[PDB]
Copies of this chain bind each other. A is one copy, B any other.
Amino acid sequence: QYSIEADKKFKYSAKLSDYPTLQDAASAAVDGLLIDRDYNFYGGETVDFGGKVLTIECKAKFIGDGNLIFTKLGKGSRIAGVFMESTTTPWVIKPWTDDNQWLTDAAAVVATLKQSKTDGYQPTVSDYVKFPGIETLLPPNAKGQNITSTLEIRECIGVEVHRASGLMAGFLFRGCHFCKMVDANNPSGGKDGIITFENLSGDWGKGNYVIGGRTSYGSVSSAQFLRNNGGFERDGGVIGFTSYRAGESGVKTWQGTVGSTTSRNYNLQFRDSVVIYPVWDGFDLGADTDMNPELDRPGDYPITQYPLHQLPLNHLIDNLLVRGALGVGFGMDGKGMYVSNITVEDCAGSGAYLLTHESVFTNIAIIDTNTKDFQANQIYISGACRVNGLRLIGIRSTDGQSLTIDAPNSTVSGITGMVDPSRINVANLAEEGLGNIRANSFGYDSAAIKLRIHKLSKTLDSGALYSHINGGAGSGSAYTQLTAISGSTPDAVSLKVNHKDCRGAEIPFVPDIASDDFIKDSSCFLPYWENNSTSLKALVKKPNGELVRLTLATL
């Protein structure tokens, strides 16, 4: 019988073109399921896949506003090529120019309004803060919109969504474990987060990843996590991902209470990823609320155990790039954190906002940030942290008085760049382990090794060692100078060696009668001027510590 042989030798796949509803096709499926016609779904339409391990291959669109809900997929199920699209074409704003300059003026942003499923985003309430005054100026038809076409995977284990795309599209994993969003094929976002792992009910989320791929646009954050804990195994997070033009942030771990419980996250990886042109932040990896925080943490550690911003979040954070944020490039909180290899460039707000304590930051580069003076500084650290390697300043100038680094409880080593030293505030700055040193000077007739005591003055060097050309180039002659500040005049007092190639030391003397207390150490002398005789005298502290006054030079 051919049918016996056929049933044994051919691959099983059901296809949607043979069925009137998606549930009918799902029920028929045994191995493969092919989406080979566009399918209009109603919001909340729910498909039961019977616990089957299905390979779902999409070659057409799921069309609808609201959520298409997939349930009871077997472990190992895979959904490839899915394409979500809204039925509604909403009003979107586009707060950047044709030369990719951010628009900050509310009226200019309102002028960008158009009806489109892409190239912009639907305003939300956070836009009222981001573009002050815009709430009053937006037409009512552009406020409070709620358009997203969302694929919801509900309460499944071991399901992977690969190469997803769409228009006004979102992807929600609700109450899932060991699920992955892999190689997202640049979906264009809607009102809700583009990729969400939300585990507010049931067990803490674990094994949930965004791996590879990219997203564009969306009103809020591109990739986000609520109530996930990767365990000590660090089994979850974001690796190899790119976010472009998030309406809020590129990658976000939620903070505070959502509903009746914690939305926070522990033990996730954030590695090898890039966020470009977010309207708010590149990476927002905080767990506690900054402004107007909850007095408790239902479902999480109490404030009595860990103070605000001091949770043992224990994320693995490495090799991240942010460029072009209108908000903050990289933000986090927590205690006992290690963070490495972070690069932030060209952000309008702070490059880094770090509400961290007893944490270590290694090889950080913050290059041309706070370019619009939105924050007090380019990098802020609240608690007692360590920074080992910090690159500051690209090519931008700073006209006002804002600090570059304000990390008042932190100890820092290894700053590089053309930082204005008056714009550094740290607890301690040191290079303990340098070798033999050479200061090489270009474009000047001198070289300098300067000292600045910030307690005395943040703006004036307190002393210096200089080398200065005698005559011109090629003269083979220079003079060395040791200086000290007096009367807030840098270099006011100095000793010289070889000025005008004289081969001698020029020694400063006290310009009047020296007081007893002017001399510091025993077996030393201090020259001073006696004008009434045209003589140099010496105040001498003898080897035995007693003072005597001698005549040093006479007419």
Bound CA span A389–B214, Å: 30
Out of B233, B508, B510, B550, which one reaches A555, CB within 8 Å?
B550
Question: Would you give the shortest CB distance from A387 to chain B, in whole angstroms?
Answer: 10
Decide yes or no whether A226 CB sits under 8 A from chain B: no
- Interface size bracket, A side: 35 or more
The answer to whether B435 and A462 have CB atoms under 8 Å apart is no
Indicate whether A439 sits within 8 Å of B437 (C-beta atoms), given known contacts A362-B394, A465-B451: yes
Bound CA span A536–B418, Å: 47
Out of B14, B234, B453, which one reaches A444, CB within 8 Å?
B453
The answer to whether A394 and B386 have CB atoms under 8 Å apart is yes
The answer to whether B534 and A548 have CB atoms under 8 Å apart is yes
Bound CA span A463–B323, Å: 43
The answer to whether A14 and B9 have CB atoms under 8 Å apart is yes
Decide yes or no whether A155 CB sits under 8 A from chain B: no
Which residue in chain B gives the minimum CB-CB distance to A81? B76
Cβ contacts under 8 Å, A437 to chain B: 430-431, 434, 437, 439, 448-450
Decide yes or no whether A517 CB sits under 8 A from chain B: yes
Which residue in chain B gives the minimum CB-CB distance to A416? B414
The answer to whether B526 and A507 have CB atoms under 8 Å apart is yes
Chain A contact residues: helix, strand, loop or mixed: strand
Within 8 A of B (CB), among A193-223: 207, 216
Binds B, one of A84-92, A103-111, A482-490: A482-490
The answer to whether B523 and A506 have CB atoms under 8 Å apart is no
Bound CA span A233–B243, Å: 9
The answer to whether B440 and A435 have CB atoms under 8 Å apart is yes
Decide yes or no whether A432 CB sits under 8 A from chain B: yes
Which residue in chain B gives the minimum CB-CB distance to A404? B433
Indicate whether A508 sits within 8 Å of B523 (C-beta atoms), given known contacts A484-B497, A500-B517, A551-B553: yes
Out of B346, B360, B493, B496, which one reaches A503, CB within 8 Å?
B493
Question: Would you give the shortest CB distance from A213 to chain B, in whole angstroms?
Answer: 10
Out of B11, B467, B479, B496, which one reaches A32, CB within 8 Å?
B11
Decide yes or no whether A131 CB sits under 8 A from chain B: no
Cβ contacts under 8 Å, A2 to chain B: 2-3, 6
Binds B, one of A63-71, A299-307, A363-371, A373-381: A363-371
**Which of A437, A496, A555 is the most central at the interface, judged by chain B CB atoms within 10 Å of its CB?**
A437
The answer to whether A529 and B523 have CB atoms under 8 Å apart is yes
Question: Would you give the shortest CB distance from A457 to chain B, in whole angstroms?
Answer: 7
The answer to whether A488 and B476 have CB atoms under 8 Å apart is yes
Which residue in chain B gives the minimum CB-CB distance to A507? B505
Decide yes or no whether A292 CB sits under 8 A from chain B: no
